[PDB]
Amino acid sequence: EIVMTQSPVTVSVSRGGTATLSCRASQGVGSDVAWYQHKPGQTPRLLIYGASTRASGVPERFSGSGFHVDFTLSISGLQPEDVAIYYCQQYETFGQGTKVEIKRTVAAPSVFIFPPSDEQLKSGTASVVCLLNNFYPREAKVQWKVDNALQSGNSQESVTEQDSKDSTYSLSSTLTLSKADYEKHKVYACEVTHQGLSSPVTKSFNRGEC
Amino acid sequence: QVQFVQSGAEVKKPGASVRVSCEASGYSFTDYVLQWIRQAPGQRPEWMGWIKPERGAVSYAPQFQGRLTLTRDLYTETAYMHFKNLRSDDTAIYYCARGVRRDASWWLQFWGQGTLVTVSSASTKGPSVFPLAPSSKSTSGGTAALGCLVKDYFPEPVTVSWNSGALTSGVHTFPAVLQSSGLYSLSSVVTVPSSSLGTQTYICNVNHKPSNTKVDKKVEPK
Amino acid sequence: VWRDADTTLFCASDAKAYETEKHNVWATHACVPTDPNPQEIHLDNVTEKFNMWKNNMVEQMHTDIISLWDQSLKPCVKLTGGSAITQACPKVSFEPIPIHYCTPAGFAILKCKDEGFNGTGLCKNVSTVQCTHGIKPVVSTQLLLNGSLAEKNITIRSENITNNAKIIIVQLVQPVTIKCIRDIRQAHCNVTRSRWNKTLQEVAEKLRTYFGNKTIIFANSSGGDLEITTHSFNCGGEFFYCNTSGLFNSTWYVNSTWNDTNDTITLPCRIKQIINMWQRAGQAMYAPPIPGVIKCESNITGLLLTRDGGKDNNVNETFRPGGGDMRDNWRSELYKYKVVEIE
Ligand SMILES: *[C@@H]1O[C@H](CO)[C@@H](O)[C@H](O)[C@H]1NC(C)=O
Ligand SMILES: *[C@@H]1O[C@H](CO)[C@@H](O)[C@H](O)[C@H]1NC(C)=O
Ligand SMILES: *[C@@H]1O[C@H](CO)[C@@H](O)[C@H](O)[C@H]1NC(C)=O
Ligand SMILES: *[C@@H]1O[C@H](CO)[C@@H](O)[C@H](O)[C@H]1NC(C)=O
Ligand SMILES: *[C@@H]1O[C@H](CO)[C@@H](O)[C@H](O)[C@H]1NC(C)=O
Ligand SMILES: *[C@@H]1O[C@H](CO)[C@@H](O)[C@H](O)[C@H]1NC(C)=O
Ligand SMILES: *[C@@H]1O[C@H](CO)[C@@H](O)[C@H](O)[C@H]1NC(C)=O
Ligand SMILES: *[C@@H]1O[C@H](CO)[C@@H](O)[C@H](O)[C@H]1NC(C)=O
Ligand SMILES: *[C@@H]1O[C@H](CO)[C@@H](O)[C@H](O)[C@H]1NC(C)=O
Ligand SMILES: [Ca+2]
Ligand SMILES: [Ca+2]
Prior knowledge:
B: 222 residues; mainly beta; Immunoglobulin-like; 7-stranded mixed β-sheet; 5-stranded antiparallel β-sheet; C: alpha+beta; HIV Envelope Protein Gp120, Chain G; globular; binds 2-acetamido-2-deoxy-beta-D-glucopyranose; viral protein/immune system; HIV; CD4-binding site; VRC23
C-alpha cells in the first residue's frame, strides 16, 4: 500500500515568484515519482518524471527534486498560464493535488442580480441569478434573502478559472424556487461579502417591478 | 509522432456497458505498455489498468476487477476498454496513454484526447435557454451585465458563444453544475457598455451536440 | 583494465553431429564443441555491478533460439502479416539440449557467485569464465521447466518488485515434477499436490519478506492470448496448452501451512495446431498429432508471476502466473553473467 500526500492544499504566489509544491510518500520509492499539470477540461500534462527529469516541451521554469519519501515540484517565475492543479504520481497511485494560483492585489467584485424570465416562470420554475464579476481573492460569501429571510440549501455556485490577463475570478450563484413560492414573495436580494468590500453589498429587485 | 485517437462520447444508464477504442500510431505498438486512466469531476486521476499488446497481457485495478476488460487488435493497432455494470460514479473522462520510455510505463507523456462517458438514470435532453436581462438600473455611461441561463440539459457538454463569435471580451461562461434532478445547468454572462443596450444586438449561441440542439437567444432589456 | 561492453558471442554445445533431433542439428552448424576442462578464476578483491534486466547476452540468445525454431519447426501455413505462406510441415524430434555462450578474444564473461544474488546490484564474489553454464533453451510460459535451481532458498528476481507492470521471476530450491500425456487433441498434466502446496507456502513466505506480514493469494491469469493464460510448452514436437487454475487458486494467511484443511493435481491440456508465434507477430498452423501415446516429464524449477496493483489494499497481495516474452526465460539463467571488454 502506497499513499502520496501533497501539500499545501493551495499555493498562492505573486507573478514572477516561485511556487514550491510537496509530495510525501508513505514508504520509500527511490526516484520513481512523476508530476502532472491539469487544467479543467484539458488533458493532464506530464511535467517531471523520475523525480527530477523535465519532460520534452516543458518550460525550464518547472523543476523537480526528490528521493525516497520527499518530492518537490518547483515553478520559478510563476505565470498566469501555470494556474492549474498539480498531481504527483507513484506508479498507479496519485496524490490528491495542489492548486496553484497567482496572488494579486485585492479587487472587489461588481455585483449584478437577474430576475427569472417570464418564459421560465410560465413553466413552473423560477431561477434567480447573482453574478460577482472580476474579483480577488476567490473567497466570497453570497447570501440570498427573500423578504429578508436568508435562503439556504436551494442555490448552487459556479466559479471561473483564474483569468490569465487580470488574475481575477468570477462567480455565479443561482437560486431555484417553484413558481408558487416565487410568487408568494416580493423582495429578492443577493448580499455579497468580500475582502475588497468595506461593508457587504446587496443587489435586489421587487417581483413585478421594472 | 506518437498519437492516440479515441472514440466519441458515450452516454449510458446504470447497469449498462461501454466500449472505448484507442487508435495508436507513430511508434511500435507491441513494445510499450498501454495505460488506461480516468478522471472524474473534481477527482484525481485514477488508474484503470494496462495492456501489453504483444500477447495481450493485462492488469486491472482491483476495484474494477469483474467488470473491466482490456483487449487489442494488432492489425489495426487499436486498443479497447470494455467496462460493464456501470454506475453513476463511473462518470468520467477516460484516456489511453503511454509512457516516456519502454521501461517507464507509468510516466505518461502521450495521451489520447479522452472519451467522456456519462452514466446516469437521466435521459438525453437539450437545454432551455432563458435571458439574464440587463438591469433597467444599469449605470448611465457605465457598464452593464447580461447573459443566458442554459438550464436543464443532459449530458455534458454545452458550448456558448456571443454574436456568432464576434463578442468575446468580457464574457464569462461558467462551469456547469449538476442539479439534484440529474440535469446540468450553466450561465454565460458578458459585461458591455450601458450606452450600447439600445443599439447593439446581443445573442447567445448555445450548442448541445449530444441532443443535436442549437439555440440562438436574443437578450435585451425587459 | 576492463569495462562493460557488448560484443558478438559464440555458442558451444555437446551436440551429436549424427542426431536428427533439431536442437542438435542447429547446434552442429551454429556452435563449437564444449571445452572438456573449462577454466574459472576467482577475481580476488573484485566488486562488480550487474543488471540482469539490461543484459545484452539475453538478446543474443533470443535471436539464436528464434533462428533455431524458424529452421526447425516449420508450419504448414504462416500468416505473418496479411500474407499467408504455404509449405511442408513434417513432424520432427524436438528436445532441448544445453547451449553455452562464450566470449571471443579481447572480451570476458564475469560471473557473480553471491548466494541468492537477485541479479541487480553489487556482487562481492566475482569470477571470470570463458563460457556460461549449459542452458537448455526451454520455451514455456508460467512455469519455468528444466532450469537451474537455487542452492538454499527460494529466490525472487524483479526489476522493481513494487511495480505491478514488472515480471517477477521465482527460482525454486526443490523441483516439482510435472508429468504430461496425450478427440486426439485432449491431454493432461499431473503434479504432486502436497509438493506443489509446500512450494506455494514457501514462495508465499519469501514474498512476505518484500511485501510485509500480509496474506498472499495465488490466482489465475487475468487475460491475454492462450499462450500466456495457460502453461504452454512443447513435448514431442507438439504444442501443449495446460489450464493452471488448479495450481494458482489458494490463499495463504501468515499462519497458513500446506497441511491446512491421490495427492495429485490434474491439469487439463489441449494440443493445438493453430498457435501464436513467440518469435514474431503472427499465426502458425501445424499438422495434427501422430497417433499414439505422447508423454513427457519435466521439472518445474521456477515461476513467472505478476502481482496485482492497487492504490488502497493492505491485508493482502495477489499474484498470477505470467510470461510470454522468452527473454525473461533466458534472463532466469543468465542473470549472473555479464560481458566485459579488455584494455
Ligand atoms: C525500483 O528499483 C530501484 C533499484 O533498481 C530502486 O532504487 C527503487 O526504489 C525501486 N522503486 C520503488 C518504487 O521501490
Ligand atoms: C563470498 O565468498 C566467501 C568465500 O567463499 C563466502 O564465505 C561468502 O559467503 C560469499 N559472499 C556472498 C555474498 O555470498
Ligand atoms: C539486490 O541485491 C543487491 C546486492 O547485490 C542489493 O543492493 C539490492 O538492495 C537488492 N535489491 C532488492 C530489491 O532487494
Ligand atoms: C494423472 O493422475 C491420474 C489420477 O491418479 C491418473 O489417472 C493419470 O494416469 C495420471 N497421469 C499421469 C501423466 O501420470
Ligand atoms: C480464471 O478463473 C475463472 C473462474 O474463477 C475462470 O472463469 C477463468 O476462465 C480462469 N482463467 C483461465 C485463464 O483459465
Ligand atoms: C480453465 O479452468 C477453469 C476452471 O475449471 C475454467 O473455468 C476455464 O474455462 C478453463 N479455461 C479454458 C480456456 O478452458
Ligand atoms: C479453487 O478453489 C476453490 C476453493 O476456494 C475450489 O472449490 C475450486 O475447486 C478451485 N478451483 C480449481 C479449478 O481447482
Ligand atoms: C525436460 O527434461 C526432460 C529430460 O529429463 C525431457 O524429457 C523433457 O522433454 C524436458 N521438458 C521440456 C519441456 O523441454
Ligand atoms: C528433477 O530434478 C531433481 C533433482 O534436482 C531429481 O530428483 C528429479 O528426479 C528430476 N525429475 C526429472 C523427471 O527430471
Ligand atoms: Ca499578471
Ligand atoms: Ca488448434
